[PDB]
Design a protein around this ligand. Structure first.
Ligand SMILES: O=C(Cc1ccccc1)Nc1nnc(CCSCCc2nnc(NC(=O)Cc3ccccc3)s2)s1
Ligand SMILES: O=C(Cc1ccccc1)Nc1nnc(CCSCCc2nnc(NC(=O)Cc3ccccc3)s2)s1
Lengths: 402, 403, 403, 402
């Protein structure tokens, strides 16, 4: 009697629960009715609300009928088994943390969005969503895709083959300039140099039209079929300006850094496409949550990413993610991130939640100000630093305990 | 309404009396050692109340309740399977298996007195559970393993802002492994000779090169729960006459005023050289490591040894800058804050779980003990400890925080 | 008062009529060639005279006089041994030995269509005196020998400091063999391909490539005294199907705004490849070399091809940034401003003496002709031509400028 | 008739030649009365200017027997066979060059002299001398001493031996702070790293009080026995602050770059000594002109340096002469030169002259501000630049043509 136990808990020992009393109780687990895992249960309460134009409260049988298929989720949500149990106040802090971070004036956009925008969207490894501010506005990943594509190539080619072509370390702050390492390979897949070679490994032999759908599919599964778009616009402008990536390409060609059969100039076309893929904070925190969640999309429970692919990517998101800010960043926030010149910080606090912070203004290394100050405050407030202690964490509050 | 009685029927499964060996081999399987200092009252009472018979004997709800009365809740948790590694027993067997497979790979050159066949591994967890195997009671110099330990002491005592005025926090790269300073005219991080030597000059800013040392030993004893920390004046003598590279760094960091006001660079070099020949065994350093793995509370004494500021920063930097030039490949393939050492040492830490120390004197080309490098890989291959595994979805790996 | 007569009676033994053929030998052992352009009128009038007179033929003082009237100024200098190398006959003996001594050095690898036993030295002194040994009339491309010439042409047309808004003037630094731009986002110097490409980018901006090229051909023709200067279309079309590295450099230059505004980098790359495919002979290129040996004036025409501001900058960077990595050891040991080329050319230049081209196609590992550097070493072994050789006290060296 | 032929030429048709007239005829030939190759003659000018009390005034036989033994030297001088025939005009050019450089007011002295000191001095392959400014003030060569010591090493050991221990190429502008090159040899004998090493090659097997004599023996033969001194003061301060040099010293020790059995700390003391050697501009011109003269001292006719050692030392000064300024220096100036932190610049125009400039204030690169201006102007005046032609040199001046 799983459904049975759940009814008594929500229905205050009386005749029944009314309609919104269920859903306001359901919207308090931070779950969202449009969760794909709740599709059935929501379908069927459309059916039973349509039994009368007068009511209706629900009997224990009427209740149990709808939540039949989804009580596994509804129990964990209502007996507060979700990775952040009091999700209700945990959002009231993120609210504050959005608010104080909204007060951060500085930063320059790339050069054409409005520097007013600012939207952070949580998505817990369990599905609990929260968002405040402008989380519905689509934007491009740009270099936020290098992890995602890097994932895809290790997901399909394995680590050994891939790093036969790209390094694994960071190169430091004086050689954010060099292309190849001592062995005539770019140093890691997070710098455009290694990214160009990675792009040259995704689906060799197939043509550039088929190649691109293969990652759009992949990029869709990672966001639980929430909004991933494409901007032809930033695509064409991203190759007309891509003189540096051409440079890299030609130098990769000369010293033979692509697989034997690569039409180098096409691979750059493909690279440039990949950067112009669109997302919203909402759709992109599910992508981050997928990395948070070992490779499984938190709101569809589908496997998208092999764990090697997801480990390797958070590993290099750590070392190599925030450009030259990586060192200081891996230090104070210590959360595998990936910045993007569009302003996206594809934050991940693994085994908890995925974030996407979007506010377009950047800093001198290429990281959203508000994006960066938000993590800082976040780590300050909650024991999320990769090497915080989960037990003796002193003045920090944990949202995984009660 | 009977917490001391609550634990009785777990071992005395509905039995009358219970042998104390039946209780302590039940407590060696908790992984704890009888010499756990937060058991002493339980172990003194039991030694005392073991002076109530001369043939045996054993204890009852009368006696037990009088003895584990003091430390009941640790024995509760210890016996309610409430330790971070519940079946510590089979986890040790894993370590044994990695240890011996990492023994047969006999490449390397000893640095330039030991036998290359030495190979010692020791674990301690944040709950105090310990294990080891091989030559783990053999004292070696911390050498560069001392560096994060000494960093920690500086941050606990001075805060993170202060200590990173004097030494950067990033890893150097496979190019600049020989430059001393980054462009900020600081050594890149506390893990390079350049950076250690600098951190050393921030401990006990004031008192003299004998109080500074005792004070590091005091800390180093607290942190190790009072296991063997020591000091091999023999190494220190040869460290300080063949130390031309270091004297180069010393003179260059003085050249670029990298120490603080009133720093006797040459004496700091002695302290450094001293701190390098500070002796530990794999065992005593397991408690060092697990202490940092434990928010700064010493797992086997319950004593707050370090800031949680201090443990975090150190583990932040052992990750990046820990394995000389192999740190990159290391952070990738094993992604555990480690720290290598010229005598064979690796100070491994699995945060929220355990601390480790490995040891085989033969270094490889890079200067990291062959068998030690081999062993840290294999352990991440095995267990989802790698800093970036998922705790829920981790493929074909074994998590030992689960039964 | 007695000018051509002064010469006329010196080649005669106070005698009757000197035969034309023994005047011919007297002027071939002066080293000049009967085809010197600065002599064409003397040979025109003397073959015309053989055409009319009969039947020896022989030569009166009046029959000698103003055949040589035109070029007597040279012709005296030739005969009173007032040339830079007075006893040129013996000096060719030493070239004939140094050629043969360098003939035995068959090591070295061609680039990848010729044959390695090809070996030719042609000497053009600043006066005109020619000597060749071995295969001098075989045509080869200039390849990166063009860089100094093209560089000269750039500064002769645009002047040092403009050219150097876009190109440094320093020799990169043996291990930084590989980075294109320096700190200021400038290439290092015009001898490196990264600078060649940007130099090329600055000659006759605005014109299109067909004209640019001919503007370069005429220039090269005069420097050679209108001896063979040509263009193999064969090597150019592969120079464009293989220069991936150059394309690398070009785009990176574009990204950093290293070309002038309104530079189509892809055609500047094509123009650049054409300058490498220009061909010459040992004979034709020793006149090019002697031109720079000659403050820019072509020894066998008398024609100012290059500003002295441009001879020097080119000779400078040929000293220091010239022979690629070997230029250090080369500036040390040979101290001559040379320039290597991957076709097998060393554009040797002994300022104030002569211009050589040596040609053996086989390159060494740094890409420089085996026999070329051997000849070059042996040549300064025997003679005080090394840059900082002393012209007065020079030990056992022979000086050819002293009789 | 050779002494008569001389006696007749310098005679103004006057039967009894004055000696005031003789010496100003001699001084203005460049030579000074203190020339050692003229002592015999100058001795007997003291002998016969002792016989009475008048002029005195020599004649066909008195003249003849004083210049009897120095005639062929006094021939070329008065037959204008001296490499710079009209040395006279040549010196006021050097004067203008000095005064033009007089106005370059920038610069910071290191830390003790007063920053208005400035001098130049010339000496030719034949002996003609000139100086202007503060050219009799002792100062330390400091770093100007590395070429001189290198010569002595090559002269005593030969090119082969010496360059088993120091390289021969230039450093490299950005990573100009490395001590060694990838052969573990210091880059060249002109960096403190290679200087220090060159210093251990001199007179192995003999203690440091005697090494220093033999160096000054050499450093005397080379300056024709003009002023060579030594400062213990600067030696004790250089001893007490060159932490960098200790660094480098220790670094060469661990890298085993000295010849076996080298007391590093002593060689550092010897280095600190050798850098504290005292010269004036004057004495240092004969230093340089000895090198300009194939190793024969212009003023004593002694062979001091085998041409080997002279060739090499003037090659390395060209390449590695002026610290990070050497690249641009060899380009624009293209005379082998050698800068010093005191302001010293030991310049050399082979086969014509040696020079030496002093000016305390340095630039941002460790080179005398005005000592630097001075060359740049000099080469802009004379076809001295190593690659100016001796026939066609555009609008420049040649001082070997009359
Ligand atoms: O933007 C600045 C300002 C700056 C300022 C201060 C300091 C430095 C720089 N400088 C820049 N300089 N170049 C840039 C473009 C990247 S370099 C071309 C890519 C590579 N070239 N050689 C490589 N090594 C190998 O390929 C190893 C190899 C091993 C064995 C055999 C062959 C090859 S990779 S940017
Ligand atoms: O061991 C090889 C063979 C090898 C092999 C391969 C390639 C070359 C050479 N060569 C050497 N290896 N170690 C050597 C002594 C190392 S220390 C040099 C003195 C400095 N220490 N930190 C510095 N940076 C800054 O003071 C600030 C700054 C940093 C960066 C930019 C601007 C400003 S400079 S030499």
């Amino acid at each position: 009697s799983l459904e049975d136990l759940l009814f008594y808990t929500i229905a205050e020992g009386q005749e029944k629960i009314p309609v919104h009393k269920f859903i306001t109780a359901l919207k308090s687990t931070g779950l969202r009715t449009s969760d794909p895992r709740l599709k059935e249960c929501m379908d069927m309460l459309r059916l039973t609300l349509q039994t009368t134009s007068d009511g209706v409260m629900l009997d224990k049988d009427l209740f149990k009928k709808c939540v039949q298929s989804n009580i596994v989720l509804l129990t964990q949500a209502f007996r507060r088994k979700f990775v952040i149990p009091d999700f209700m106040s945990f959002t009231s802090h993120i609210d504050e943390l959005y608010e104080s971070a909204k007060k951060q004036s500085g930063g320059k956009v790339a050069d054409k969005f409005s520097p007013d925008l600012w939207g952070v969207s949580v998505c817990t490894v369990d599905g609990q969503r929260h968002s405040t501010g402008d989380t519905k506005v689509p934007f491009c990943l740009q270099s936020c895709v290098k992890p995602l594509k890097y994932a895809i190539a290790v997901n399909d080619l394995g680590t050994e083959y891939v790093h036969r072509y790209v390094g694994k370390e960071p190169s430091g702050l004086r050689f954010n300039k060099l292309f190849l390492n001592e062995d005539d390979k770019p140093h890691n897949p997070m710098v455009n140099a290694g990214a160009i070679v990675v792009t040259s490994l995704i689906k060799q032999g197939v043509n550039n039209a088929e190649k691109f759908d293969y990652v759009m599919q992949f990029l869709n599964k990672m966001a639980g079929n929430e909004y991933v778009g494409f901007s032809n616009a930033t695509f064409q402008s991203e190759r007309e300006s891509g003189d540096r990536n051409f440079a890299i390409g030609y130098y990769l060609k000369e010293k033979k850094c692509f697989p034997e059969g690569t039409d180098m100039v096409g691979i750059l076309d493909f690279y440039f496409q990949l950067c112009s893929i669109e997302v919203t904070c909402e759709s992109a925190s599910v992508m981050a949550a997928t990395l948070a969640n070992g490779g499984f999309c938190p709101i569809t429970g589908e496997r998208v990413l092999s764990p090697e692919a997801v480990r390797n990517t958070l590993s290099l998101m750590h070392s190599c993610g925030m450009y030259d800010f990586s060192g200081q960043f891996a230090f104070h926030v210590g959360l595998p991130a990936k910045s993007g010149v569009a302003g996206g910080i594809l934050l991940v606090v693994p085994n908890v939640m995925g974030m996407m912070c979007w506010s377009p203004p950047l800093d001198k290394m290429g990281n959203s100000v508000k994006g960066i100050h938000f993590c800082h405050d976040l780590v300050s407030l909650c024991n999320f630093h990769n090497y915080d202690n989960l037990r003796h964490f002193a003045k920090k509050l944990d949202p995984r305990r009660e």
